[PDB]
Design an enzyme around this catalytic site. Structure first.
Site, PDB file in Angstrom:
ATOM      1  N   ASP A 273       0.794  -1.268  -0.015  1.00  0.00           N
ATOM      2  CA  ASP A 273       0.119  -0.069   0.120  1.00  0.00           C
ATOM      3  C   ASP A 273       0.842   1.119  -0.096  1.00  0.00           C
ATOM      4  OD1 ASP A 273      -2.009  -2.343   0.717  1.00  0.00           O
ATOM      5  OD2 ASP A 273      -3.237  -0.338   1.136  1.00  0.00           O
TER       6      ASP A 273
ATOM      7  N   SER B 239      -1.907   1.921   6.448  1.00  0.00           N
ATOM      8  CA  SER B 239      -2.080   3.142   5.340  1.00  0.00           C
ATOM      9  C   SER B 239      -3.155   4.621   5.873  1.00  0.00           C
ATOM     10  CB  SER B 239      -2.841   2.573   4.256  1.00  0.00           C
ATOM     11  OG  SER B 239      -1.976   1.432   3.829  1.00  0.00           O
TER      12      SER B 239
ATOM     13  N   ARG C 120      -9.068   2.700   9.784  1.00  0.00           N
ATOM     14  CA  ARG C 120      -7.771   3.012   9.003  1.00  0.00           C
ATOM     15  C   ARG C 120      -8.107   3.493   7.716  1.00  0.00           C
ATOM     16  NH1 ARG C 120      -8.444  -3.174   8.619  1.00  0.00           N
ATOM     17  NH2 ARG C 120      -8.467  -3.954   6.589  1.00  0.00           N
ATOM     18  N   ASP C 121      -6.886   3.638   7.010  1.00  0.00           N
ATOM     19  CA  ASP C 121      -6.833   4.216   5.724  1.00  0.00           C
ATOM     20  C   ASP C 121      -7.822   5.430   5.787  1.00  0.00           C
ATOM     21  OD1 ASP C 121      -5.874   1.217   5.423  1.00  0.00           O
ATOM     22  OD2 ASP C 121      -7.075   0.830   3.796  1.00  0.00           O
TER      23      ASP C 121
ATOM     24  N   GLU D 234     -11.638  -1.277   1.487  1.00  0.00           N
ATOM     25  CA  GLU D 234     -10.130  -0.606   1.904  1.00  0.00           C
ATOM     26  C   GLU D 234     -10.148   0.330   1.000  1.00  0.00           C
ATOM     27  OE1 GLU D 234      -7.955  -4.460   1.801  1.00  0.00           O
ATOM     28  OE2 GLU D 234      -8.106  -3.930   3.884  1.00  0.00           O
TER      29      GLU D 234
HETATM   30  O1  LIG Z   1      -1.078  -4.043   5.876  1.00  0.00           O
HETATM   31  C1  LIG Z   1      -2.573  -3.093   6.124  1.00  0.00           C
HETATM   32  C2  LIG Z   1      -3.028  -2.453   5.087  1.00  0.00           C
HETATM   33  O2  LIG Z   1      -3.321  -3.224   3.663  1.00  0.00           O
HETATM   34  C3  LIG Z   1      -4.586  -2.973   3.498  1.00  0.00           C
HETATM   35  O3  LIG Z   1      -5.455  -4.116   3.988  1.00  0.00           O
HETATM   36  C4  LIG Z   1      -4.798  -3.006   1.875  1.00  0.00           C
HETATM   37  O4  LIG Z   1      -3.604  -4.000   1.366  1.00  0.00           O
HETATM   38  C5  LIG Z   1      -5.232  -1.680   4.085  1.00  0.00           C
HETATM   39  O5  LIG Z   1      -6.400  -1.574   4.419  1.00  0.00           O
HETATM   40  C6  LIG Z   1      -4.345  -1.564   5.209  1.00  0.00           C
HETATM   41  O6  LIG Z   1      -3.911  -0.302   5.645  1.00  0.00           O
END
Ligand SMILES: OC[C@H]1O[C@](O)(CO)[C@@H](O)[C@@H]1O
Ligand SMILES: [Ca+2]
Ligand SMILES: [Ca+2]
Length: 520
Positions: free
Chosen positions: A96, A165, A247-248, A347
């Site tokens: 990511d 992320s 997250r994200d 995600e």
């Molecule tokens: O490794 C964790 C990261 O990878 C994800 O699942 C997508 O590949 C994101 O949601 C997260 O930030």
């Protein structure tokens, strides 16, 4: 043994003879709640998810991730670097990633003539989740010209405190505001996720960018319990079937001077996960026959029933205060998108403004959805089940409507264990155009699944056309690996593969990796 009138109505609208139903089917139908009131924004319905999967199975060129010429793919040199946890130089997986962007337009920022990207990296097969700052000359198209500054939160890191992320933009004084996910694993190794922020001060010295200082590192948000699921809520009921997500975070500012985070979460008690969701007609979203067929299917299989019981993925939104360098939550809203009954993981939400519309995109693995048949059929047809979905609104917190009917935008085209497999699609705007985005992604799945020293690297990027009628079309326009800035000179049609050249020799005869793709 006897249907209530609502239930008899839908049964009959469906063309099903009420006498054909069993006592258990009647009992299921009599629990059905027929209210049509939306609770947590626009929903990815059971019908939408099925359509996304069907589209992936059809492998229609309008939506398929393009074939990449496997012979051209290489590891990222900047991903061989001093590791945040071991303090030793290693060839790392890089997955990511996100560019430092202009907070209003989304354009890849020009910082003192550099482009900057922040990326998750780690040693294959270790728990080693940390973020690193990367740079290159602005406009440069060579994967090998990217340089790794190092882990933003330093060396001597451990798996007890991880970075996942988020996003990054320029502040007014040309410092960088980082949004990321702080993950604390001290409570029995759980991925206790939190949206956090810090300010990065860099310096530019003779072609090199250095990280001078990380300031104001703090937690912005980790859920409220009503709109978004909290850690404590998840911990209270989790026996291993429930996902946890906070997250994200994607930062974006609109024309009213309001800065927002759009983030990955699960719904809270506003419209919470539970077995009851199987009996909310709103979640199904098909015609009467589809909805009834779907209800019986869910109740016929313990794993589908369980997934449906625990599914409540959300794309959240909140407004921040004005303080660029010390953001705190100013206001919470109901989710922009939710998938109760349907999926527990969506995600990398991303908002691109094009003209005066807001396009909301996200990556998802269909095997995190409740419909086992649909995603197991995706696996059987293609060897993978990943997708990018998309929605569109006339305002940032407005009602988002799915693109291409079901919300499908990109569908997997190759098996998940091939060198040219992709994920974590991330759309970036293109200078001078209001009807195209450049789709970036990481290539090769983590942890050596594609074989000896096939690290996760940066994919070639490709153009995606956005049409004014809320549809999209994949274009046969591709860059070098790791290109974040499309222009006329960035095109490399030699990177385009086909079915045949998307595989390295032998890959077709390679065994399936079942943990990677799933099996119900
Ligand atoms: O490794 C964790 C990261 O990878 C994800 O699942 C997508 O590949 C994101 O949601 C997260 O930030
Ligand atoms: Ca859940
Ligand atoms: Ca370029």
């Amino acid at each position: 043994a006897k249907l209530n009138k609502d239930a008899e109505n839908v049964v009959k609208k469906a063309g099903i003879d009420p006498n054909s139903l069993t006592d258990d089917q009647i009992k299921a139908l009599n629990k059905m709640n027929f209210s049509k009131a939306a609770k947590s924004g626009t929903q990815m319905t059971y019908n939408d998810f099925q359509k996304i999967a069907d589209t992936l199975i059809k492998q229609d060129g309008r939506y398929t991730v393009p074939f990449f010429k496997a012979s051209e793919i290489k590891n990222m040199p900047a991903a061989t670097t001093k590791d945040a946890q071991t303090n030793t130089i290693e060839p790392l997986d890089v997955w990511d990633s996100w560019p430092v962007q202009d907070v209003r337009t989304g354009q890849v920022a020009n910082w003192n003539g550099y482009q900057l990207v922040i990326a998750m990296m780690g040693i294959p097969n270790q728990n080693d989740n940390h973020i690193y700052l990367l740079y290159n000359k602005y406009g440069d198209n060579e994967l090998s010209h990217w340089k790794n500054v190092g882990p933003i939160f330093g060396y001597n890191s451990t798996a007890v405190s991880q970075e996942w992320s988020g996003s990054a933009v320029l502040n007014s004084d040309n410092s960088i505001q980082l949004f990321y996910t702080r993950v604390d694993t001290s409570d029995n190794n759980t991925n206790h996720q939190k949206i956090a922020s810090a300010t990065l001060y860099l310096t530019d010295n003779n072609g090199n960018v250095s990280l001078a200082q990380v300031a104001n590192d703090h937690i912005v948000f980790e859920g409220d319990g009503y709109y978004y699921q909290t850690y404590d809520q998840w911990k209270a009921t989790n026996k291993g079937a429930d996902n946890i997500a906070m997250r994200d975070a994607h930062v974006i500012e609109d024309d009213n001077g309001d800065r927002y985070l759009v983030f990955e979460a699960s719904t809270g008690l506003e419209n919470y996960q539970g077995e009851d969701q199987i009996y909310n007609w709103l979640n199904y979203g098909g015609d009467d026959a589809f909805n009834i067929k779907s209800l019986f299917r869910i109740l016929s299989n313990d794993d589908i029933k369980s997934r449906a019981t625990w599914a409540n993925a959300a794309i959240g939104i909140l407004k921040l205060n004005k303080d660029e360098k010390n953001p705190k939550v100013a206001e919470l809203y109901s989710p922009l998108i939710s998938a109760p009954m349907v999926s527990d993981e969506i995600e990398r939400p991303n908002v691109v403004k094009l003209g005066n519309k807001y396009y909301l995109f996200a990556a998802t693995r269909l095997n995190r959805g409740s419909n086992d048949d649909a995603w197991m059929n995706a696996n059987y047809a293609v060897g993978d089940n990943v997708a990018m979905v998309g929605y569109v609104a006339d305002s940032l917190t407005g009602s988002y409507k799915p693109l291409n009917d079901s919300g499908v935008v990109l569908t997997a085209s190759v098996p998940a264990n091939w060198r040219t497999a992709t994920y974590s699609y991330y759309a970036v705007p293109v200078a001078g155009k209001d009807d195209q985005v450049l789709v970036t992604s990481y290539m090769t799945n983590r942890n050596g699944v594609a074989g000896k020293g096939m690290d996760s690297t940066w994919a070639p990027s490709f153009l995606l056309q956005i049409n004014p009628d809320n549809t999209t079309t994949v274009l046969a326009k591709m860059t070098n690996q790791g290109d974040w800035i499309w222009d006329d000179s960035s095109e490399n049609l030699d990177m385009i593969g086909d079915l045949d050249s998307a595989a390295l020799p032998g890959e077709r005869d390679k065994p399936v990796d079942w943990d990677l793709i799933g099996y119900g």
